[PDB]
């Protein structure tokens, strides 16, 4: 063939999807003027409450939580009792978000007229106008910007916004996307005494991340990662998984997030429904033969062999399990059969920054970058789980080797990390 390859050469390049490049991202580093230690949190709890059945419960929760002393709460939970105002929660949203976009536009050389798509997510706090309209008002973005504000979707909506900005960058060529993933802790606080609602008091901390995605080929040599796959999984059709992370009000009228005791069994079963989709996508077919050389000799001889799970350590170099709690990283390690060096970004992110809900994956990625472990061609797996039990996952591929002076949230304190973490905090 000599002339009928241009028809193949134009049916392949117009059907190939546009690549979505992660140019750079900036994570909000909260200051040491907002850190809440163990003893400060426990004395703040002991002053406002009267019963020593809730304080002794929160002591065990916070000492088995896997957090540290540098975890930061907003400047309203430093008061006894706290002040969950609307202006105090909106000014915190102008602190964690605007300091993450200012850090991003000074390291990328980004213009505010260059941003075409703006996808902001924050679970509980959703003011009128949006946080996206707040960003548009502050940075003077264009009138034809395509802004979206996904609210109420929990701690897995960071990858929902990443998949949304991916699907918007296929329709619109030569565009930049701005993804902001935050969680405002000032209206998240629980003023009551129900024990299932006091676990979000001892877990969630300050944090945000501004993410710059693009599909231009000019920003393919400056870019850090290429988005390979985003795999979503919604276990909300089950009634046990839908009412797992449920926002209720107690019998005294205080709103809050009520976690279930069966959450870790549901978070494990939301991952294995996500593993069965992302498995054929990322595993090499050198050993994707577990379903054709091993399964065909089962239902005629013996159903059930002793377990040899698909080794995901052959498909990925880095793992970014969402830092929900200590016991959830402990279980998803044993489901994936991970080494303790693989779950090190998640553990040290929960230790240093706490359960920053929608943006823990970016603090984990900045940990893997700032340790000098992000080499060229390394594949990254970000597993993120939240409310409604959406368990979304993203596979990034590193384009260029990151140099260890990173200018991220970790560079002030990563000479001490990884810290050895005993499972209790003695008091």
């Amino acid at each position: 063939s000599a002339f009928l390859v241009v028809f193949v050469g134009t049916v392949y390049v117009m059907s190939r999807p546009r690549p979505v490049y992660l140019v750079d991202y900036a994570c909000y580093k909260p200051p040491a003027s907002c850190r809440v230690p163990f003893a400060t949190f426990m004395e703040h709890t002991r002053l406002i409450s009267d019963d020593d059945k809730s304080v002794r419960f929160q002591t065990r929760i916070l000492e088995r939580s896997g957090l540290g002393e540098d975890t930061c709460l907003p400047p309203a939970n430093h008061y006894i009792p706290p002040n969950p105002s609307m202006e105090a929660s909106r000014a915190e949203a102008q602190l964690v978000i605007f300091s993450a976009i200012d850090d991003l536009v000074r390291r990328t050389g980004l213009k505010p007229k260059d941003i075409d798509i703006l996808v902001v997510n924050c679970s509980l706090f959703s003011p009128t106008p949006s946080l996206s309209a707040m960003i548009i008002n502050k940075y003077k973005l264009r009138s034809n910007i395509r802004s979206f504000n996904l609210s109420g979707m929990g701690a897995s909506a960071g990858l929902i916004s990443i998949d949304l900005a991916r699907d918007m960058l296929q329709v619109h060529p030569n565009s930049n996307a701005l993804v902001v993933s935050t969680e405002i802790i000032t209206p998240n606080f629980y003023q009551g005494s129900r024990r299932d609602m006091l676990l979000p008091n001892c877990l969630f901390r300050m944090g945000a991340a501004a993410i710059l995605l693009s599909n231009r080929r000019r920003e393919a040599r400056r870019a850090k990662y290429r988005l390979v796959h985003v795999v979503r999984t919604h276990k909300g059709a089950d009634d046990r998984a839908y009412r797992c992370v449920y926002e209720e009000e107690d019998e005294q009228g205080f709103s809050g997030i009520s976690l279930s005791k069966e959450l870790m069994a549901i978070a494990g079963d939301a991952l294995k429904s996500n593993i069965t989709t992302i498995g054929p996508l990322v595993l090499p077919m050198s050993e994707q033969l577990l379903f054709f050389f091993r399964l065909v000799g089962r239902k005629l001889v013996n159903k059930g062999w002793r377990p040899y799970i698909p080794d995901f350590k052959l498909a990925f170099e880095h793992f970014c399990i969402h830092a929900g709690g200590r016991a959830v990283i402990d279980e998803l390690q044993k489901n994936l059969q991970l080494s303790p060096r693989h779950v090190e970004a998640s553990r040290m992110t929960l230790h240093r920054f706490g359960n920053t809900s929608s943006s823990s994956l970016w603090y984990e990625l900045a940990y893997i970058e700032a340790k000098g472990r992000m080499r060229r061609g390394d594949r990254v797996w970000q597993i993120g789980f939240g409310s409604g039990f959406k368990c979304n996952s993203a596979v990034w591929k590193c384009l260029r080797s990151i140099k260890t002076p990173t200018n991220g949230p970790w560079d002030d304190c990563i000479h001490r990390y990884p810290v050895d973490v005993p499972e209790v905090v003695k008091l």
């Binding site: 040491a32 003027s33 850190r35 230690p37 400060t40 002991r46 002053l47 540098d70 008061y79 006894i80």
Partner: protein, 411 residues
């Protein structure tokens, strides 16, 4: 015109201390029942919002991290008869109490009514939750003039009164943009052995206290801060004509005046305590109780008949110092107001060194909490550096009698 609108908040150290245990000295545990109430009045609190005042407290507590800790107790190695406490340096923090007062400050400074130091310092105590009680409370009271009052409620366990004052001045130096000097905690405190089963006659051995470090009085205590001027100080120096004196002419005359003034009210206060803040007895440490506590007897005539010159002559030389036997005693003791009347020498202490931006304080008064029902005399410096200020912490039965008995000499 009362103080209202209290908002509580904490300031922690900016750097994590870790699992550090600050060992207390044998002198720190002798003063654990008393407290300090220091108020610093400012004319113009412009630009000094309760973020500008609270932000230098995060570098200030990195150097002074035992003040941001809590007090715990260690267990015995054999039978559990002693339990020596220590300051576990968890960064629990220092309380900040943002209050307001609609009264104007210049009227309230010159009012001479008892109960002013109690309203501007957050009156708390290492109390019924001993493991969860702060060692320092800072109250910021906004006035109708725009005037600022910083009320420092300092637990006397963690430091002395010059230690408290330099610990506050090192915060004001960070606030003013300056650089504070070195905070020395480098030699750790250790217990001693001296075999002392007998209490000195300068303290009062109170009973076993377990989880409340405050001896109650039962009466209404009242701290009355009257000002002793320069002209009445020179009138005190006319009573040694032809007589050689070694009394410091600004403390023993004034404390002798207050001694005979309360000796004309009470029956027989034959001996008194002098708690000198001696500059030579201080070591290099920044949080330590280097006081000089000692009694002094009358050893002759009554202190209600004589005059203040011979009282100062017996007050300078006849001090039997017991500041080692105070720290060496086993049981809990009461220094300030416990056994006898105490005449404190908080007069070379840099009270007016709390220049927060460029502003000298208008008026600084120090009170005490936990004083027993005998009284405490706090001879302080004034703003000019020549006159003095005396805060008398007595029961309220004899406060209005003291204002009449002192008025014959103070004019």
């Amino acid at each position: 015109g009362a103080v209202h609108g209290h908002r509580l908040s904490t300031v922690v150290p900016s750097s994590v201390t870790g699992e550090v245990d600050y060992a207390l000295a044998d002198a720190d545990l002798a003063f654990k029942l008393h407290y300090l109430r220091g108020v610093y009045y400012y004319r113009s609190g412009d630009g000094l919002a309760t973020k500008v005042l609270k932000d230098p407290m995060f570098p200030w507590l990195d150097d002074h991290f035992p003040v941001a800790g809590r007090v715990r107790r260690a267990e015995a190695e054999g039978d559990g008869a002693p339990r020596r406490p220590y300051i576990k340096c968890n960064d629990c923090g220092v309380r900040i109490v943002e209050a307001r007062c609609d009264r104007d400050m210049a009227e309230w400074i010159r009012d001479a009514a008892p109960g002013r130091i109690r309203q501007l310092c957050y009156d708390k105590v290492l109390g019924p939750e001993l493991f969860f009680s702060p060692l320092l409370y800072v109250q910021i009271t906004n006035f109708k003039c725009g005037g600022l009052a910083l009320g420092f409620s300092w637990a006397h366990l963690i430091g002395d009164i010059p230690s408290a004052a330099t610990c506050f001045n090192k915060w004001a130096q960070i606030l003013s943009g300056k650089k504070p000097e070195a905070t020395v905690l480098t030699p750790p405190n250790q217990p001693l052995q001296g075999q002392s089963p007998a209490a000195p006659r300068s303290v009062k051995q109170v009973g076993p206290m377990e989880d409340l470090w405050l001896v109650p009085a039962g009466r209404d205590m009242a701290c009355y801060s009257f000002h002793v001027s320069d002209a009445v100080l020179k009138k005190l120096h006319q009573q040694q004509n032809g007589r050689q004196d070694a009394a410091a002419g600004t403390f023993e005359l004034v404390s002798a005046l207050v001694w005979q003034a309360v000796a004309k009210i009470r029956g027989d206060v034959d001996t008194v305590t002098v708690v000198r803040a001696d500059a030579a007895a201080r070591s290099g440490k920044s949080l330590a109780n280097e006081m000089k506590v000692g009694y002094v007897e009358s050893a002759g005539s009554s202190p209600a008949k004589t005059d203040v010159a011979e009282l100062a002559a017996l007050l300078a030389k006849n001090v039997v110092d017991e500041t080692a036997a105070v720290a060496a005693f086993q049981g809990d003791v009461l220094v300030y107001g416990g056994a006898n009347l105490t005449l404190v020498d908080m007069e070379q202490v840099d009270l007016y060194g709390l220049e927060i931006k460029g502003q000298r304080p208008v008026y600084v008064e120090y009170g005490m909490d936990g004083v027993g029902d005998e009284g405490a005399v706090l001879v302080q410096p004034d703003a000019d550096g020549r006159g003095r200020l005396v805060t008398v912490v007595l029961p309220g039965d004899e406060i209005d009698s003291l204002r009449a008995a002192l008025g014959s000499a103070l004019h």
